[PDB]
Design a binder for this molecule. Structure first.
Ligand SMILES: *C(=O)/C=C/c1ccc(O)cc1
Length: 124
């Protein structure tokens, strides 16, 4: 898929893309509901983190999968965005739960329709 990390209209491009198409992206992509449950999780993300995508779909990202993100610096930003109904933030972070610590750039953006939220990830 021909989409760049951080693209201004990424929510339109990805809107309603199915799991197979998401697996074509150059960067990790996770779709979360407003509670942080995982709705979609692509192959590039699994390559970065070791998680098996179909296994983490339905789990809570903050509670279960990624406790290192349960902090004001990641989850706090996410929940503020869910509560506001608007989110577009980009920041670096280190992923380190049961994995070699890995520095990444994270872009969280509210999905176009409904109430879903993207978490995009690339190595830095
Ligand atoms: C910290 O616990 C981060 C873990 C993590 C981040 C992103 C993922 O897709 C999976 C686990």
């Amino acid at each position: 898929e021909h989409v760049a990390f951080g693209s201004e209209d990424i929510e339109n491009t990805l809107a309603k893309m199915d799991d197979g198409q998401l697996d074509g992206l150059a960067f990790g992509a996770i779709q979360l509901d407003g509670d942080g449950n995982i709705l979609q999780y692509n192959a590039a993300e699994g390559d970065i983190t070791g998680r098996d995508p179909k296994q983490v779909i339905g789990k809570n990202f903050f509670k279960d999968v990624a406790p290192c993100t349960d902090s004001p610096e990641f989850y706090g930003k996410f929940k503020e965005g869910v509560a506001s109904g608007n989110l577009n933030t980009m920041f670096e972070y280190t992923f380190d739960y049961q994995m070699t610590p890995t520095k990444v750039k994270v872009h969280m953006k509210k999905a176009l329709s409904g109430d879903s939220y993207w978490v995009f990830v690339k190595r830095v």
